[PDB]
Design a protein around this ligand. Sequence first.
Ligand SMILES: [Zn+2]
Lengths: 103, 161, 134, 68
Amino acid sequence: DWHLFCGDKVEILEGKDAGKQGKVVQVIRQRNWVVVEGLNTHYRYVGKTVDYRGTMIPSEAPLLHNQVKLVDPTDRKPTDVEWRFTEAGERVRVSTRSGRIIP
Amino acid sequence: GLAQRAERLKKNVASQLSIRKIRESDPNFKIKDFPEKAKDIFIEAHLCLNNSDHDRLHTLVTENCFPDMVWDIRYKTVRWSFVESLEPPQVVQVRCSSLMNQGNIYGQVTVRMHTRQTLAIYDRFGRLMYGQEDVPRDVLEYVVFEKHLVDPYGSWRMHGK
Amino acid sequence: EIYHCRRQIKYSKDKMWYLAKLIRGMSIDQALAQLEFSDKKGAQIIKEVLLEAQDMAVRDHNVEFRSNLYVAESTSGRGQYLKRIRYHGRGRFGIMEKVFCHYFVKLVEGXXXXXXXXXXXXXXXXXXXXXXXX
Amino acid sequence: AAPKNRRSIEVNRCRRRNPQKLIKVKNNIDVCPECGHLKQKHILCGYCXXXXXXXXXXXXXXXXXXXX
Ligand SMILES: [Zn+2]
């Protein structure tokens, strides 16, 4: 029973970035957090000493999974996850609102 | 003078090609509304340089061309300097050119303006004076406004030169 | 003010303090020449510290005149100690403590002014007449 | 023998500072008549001489290698 997986479009209900929607680049289960595309912009330093040119690049800092919710392919609204077995004889996770299959 | 410039902006190959890219991709935009809005963002930019606001400068104003001026102002912070600048006036607003990139969904528009700048700099405790107070310098500037397309919000971010 | 510091360097603090008090109050040039021709282990190190302090003074503070720089303060602190085993006779071991010194240099602009001159007759005739009236 | 009691700070300071006079500072500094570099008094320069002594050593080694 897991919540968020890599590649899905998700919504944020909490924080400075709350309300924005975006795909997930990477999911780490060690620190329990997710990374949303083009979200929570922070400064990163990649320098070049020989070329004398330092380069500062924006990057997406990992966000807590509790502040992030999945988006249903049909309803398009943010919703909680539920585990069900469809009539096709499959084990799947679907929205608590509609019957659309998330996977 | 202004008419010839306008003809060089509208009727020239590369420029009108970039305009074609914009209009075809996003018909909801407008060419004539660009210089004034970019002017406003420029004023806000200089005001951010004066008020020393890093967040708004990074998010709104500059993208990837910032670390030069940022390291400048932050080194000025290391030397503990007070930077006070004012640049309200404007004479003639005319854009320069445009350069775009397809694959990375990137864009740039070079725009030049005429502004009267007043730059005053104080240093540390001993008040080491750099620049001049209340002196209307005449400055001609070239700023390239970049456009990037993401899902949550459109990105308009200036580039100093 | 221009500050410069060096830590985790291993030298005798009491010995470095000798060359530390040497350049205290003295101007940059005289201190440079001194430390250059001074004979000790601290001479080279404090010379490096001074040179770096001058480089930082010129580059960071953008000082107009280098002659307006002098040494206002210099101090030597003590860092961590490395405990080593010194083998002695009759199966006894002594503890050899390897010391450390943290060198701190504080520079202030302007011409250096130090007066150690004190008139004996004036000070006596004043302090005695003021103590007899109190 | 062994110390009777631990030394106080005052005695230590007065002993380690005043009589030794720290390091007495005289003027050893003089300008080189040739290159104008600052060097020690009553002594040859360390700039225009060490390089010429190394060039004279290389010339003596080259002459000794050419003569052999
Ligand atoms: Zn010489």
